[PDB]
Design a protein around this nucleic acid. Structure first.
Ligand SMILES: [Ca+2]
Ligand SMILES: [Ca+2]
Length: 314
DNA sequence: GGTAGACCTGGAC
DNA sequence: GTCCAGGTCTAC
């Protein structure tokens, strides 16, 4: 059929594949796990969302990652568009190598990794990542998802429509910095987070040097990148880490939230050393991130995703 | 310098 | 009718 979301079975000639075994990527463990909030399983095993300014539907078989694009006459994805998918999932990074190493230095990781293979990090756009996580504050994944959709719908450019779903690109800095955005966001239910979206959009354009200032962080060290991000309204130590990890290519970045605290205590019997507090505080949270970095290495953040993801499965 | 309380809301015991 | 989710900000 020419309408609605496509499936591999119904529109054979419109899909193209990318060699990728399920052991290197599990869509169902990556896409709805709190990394990106813009993918939906409209059909069983078929996920749709915006990727590289276009709408896609992705699905996998044991050895392949099938992709289709909705842009002109309908056709299969081209080799270059397909490369956009490979980059988004950072497919050049071998997950089997990472799991092996983490499992070698951490017996607990080894036991948990057995059942949760294919958990990796998406290479996300900084703007979308910054504002999506500004909205994650004291929030759950299902709600965050709603807020983000409503936000893109009201301020993001309109893409194509499939069935009754109209896809929108993520809002630009200029749009989010506009007049009365906060009030509009409050009517959309963002709460106090509405204030931060508006404020950070303006801070970036009117005080930090614009988009270029954000994008240049990819070349800066984790230390430098993380410090700059905390300048923004609504961005604390955690939000900044999420952004460094998921959008600025800092794999050693470890976001410390309540989930990670429960994991550290239960599975590692961890307790703060150099810090005062017995529980969560800026000093203890910083120490915990260091604990995981020294345990897992340069890609501690990715290791964190494997457990964090396998933890949400409870 | 390091804790305590306000800020929004909708699924949940 | 109370409680929590990938926190942040600020007063003292
Ligand atoms: Ca800040
Ligand atoms: Ca927290």
């Amino acid at each position: 059929s020419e309408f609605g979301h496509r499936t591999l079975a119904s529109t054979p000639a419109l899909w193209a594949s990318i060699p990728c075994p399920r052991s290197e990527l599990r869509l169902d463990l990556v896409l709805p796990s709190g990394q990106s909030f813009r993918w939906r399983e409209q059909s069983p095993a078929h996920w749709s969302g915006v990727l590289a300014d276009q709408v896609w539907t992705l699905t996998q078989t044991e050895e392949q990652l099938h992709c289709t694009v909705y842009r002109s006459q309908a056709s299969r994805p081209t080799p270059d568009e397909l490369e956009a998918v490979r980059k988004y999932f950072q497919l050049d990074v071998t997950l089997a190598q990472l799991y092996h190493h983490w499992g070698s230095v951490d017996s607990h990781f080894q036991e948990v990794a057995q059942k949760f293979q294919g958990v990796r990090l998406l290479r996300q756009d900084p703007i979308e990542c910054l504002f999506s996580f500004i909205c994650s504050s004291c929030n759950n994944i299902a709600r965050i998802t709603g807020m983000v959709e409503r936000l893109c719908q009201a301020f993001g450019p309109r893409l194509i429509q499939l069935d009754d779903v109209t896809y929108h690109g993520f809002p630009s800095l200029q749009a989010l910095a506009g007049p009365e955005v906060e009030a509009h966001l409050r009517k959309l239910g963002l709460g106090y987070r509405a204030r931060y979206v508006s404020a950070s959009a303006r801070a970036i354009l009117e005080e930090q040097g614009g988009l270029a200032w954000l994008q240049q962080l990819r070349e800066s060290s984790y230390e430098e990148a993380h410090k700059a991000l905390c300048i923004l309204p609504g961005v604390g130590t955690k939000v900044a880490d999420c952004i460094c990890l998921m959008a600025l290519d800092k794999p050693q970045a470890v976001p410390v939230d309540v989930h990670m605290w429960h994991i550290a205590q239960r599975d590692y019997s961890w307790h703060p050393t150099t810090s005062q507090a017995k529980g969560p505080s800026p000093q203890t949270n910083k120490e915990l991130g260091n604990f995981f970095r020294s345990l897992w290495g340069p890609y501690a953040g990715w290791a964190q995703a494997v457990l964090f993801s396998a933890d949400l499965r409870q």
